[PDB]
Amino acid sequence: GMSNKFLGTWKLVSSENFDDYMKALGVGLATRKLGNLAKPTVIISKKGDIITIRTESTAKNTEISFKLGQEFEETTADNRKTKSIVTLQRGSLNQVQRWDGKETTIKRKLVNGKMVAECKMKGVVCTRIYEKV
Numbered sequence: 001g002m003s004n005k006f007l008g009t010w011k012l013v014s015s016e017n018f019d020d021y022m023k024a025l026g027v028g029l030a031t032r033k034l035g036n037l038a039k040p041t042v043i044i045s046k047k048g049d050i051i052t053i054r055t056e057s058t059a060k061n062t063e064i065s066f067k068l069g070q071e072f073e074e075t076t077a078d079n080r081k082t083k084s085i086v087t088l089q090r091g092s093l094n095q096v097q098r099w100d101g102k103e104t105t106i107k108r109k110l111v112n113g114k115m116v117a118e119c120k121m122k123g124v125v126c127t128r129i130y131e132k133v
């Protein structure tokens with residue numbers, strides 16, 4: 001299952017191309033400004049087979065809980081209401097969100113003790129790097 005090394009609190013330390021990823025998602029300028037400045041924490045926890053990923057920032061807080069492989073409804077930081085599924089593939093937590101005939105993917109993997117989130121929307125790619133607090 002998910003490596004226990006995912007568990008704990010992560011702090012954003014670097015990000016590339018997040019503005020364009022937000023643009024692709026239909027996020028407006030005022031909110032993109034927050035997104036490009038914010039350095040959120042991401043808290044990952046688990047109870048039984050339920051994984052929880054909480055994101056905390058002044059910009060916005062979000063929280064999802066899920067079982068691997070099972071679709072759930074999600075409200076995203078930019079207020080999209082999506083049908084989402086997270087699966088584990090070769091160590092990576094692969095989140096797919098679907099809404100309005102659109103889809104985006106966020107893959108989270110552990111690389112060199114960091115958590116690397118790779119986000120893709122119609123060919124626009126960003127990467128966000130987190131360090132463990």
Ligand SMILES: CCCCCCCCCCCCCCCC(=O)O
Binds near residue numbers: 042
């Ligand atoms: C919490 C991020 C900053 C808030 C900006 C408002 C919402 C726009 C961004 C929507 C998608 C966020 C995906 C984040 C992926 C990650 O966990 O690094």
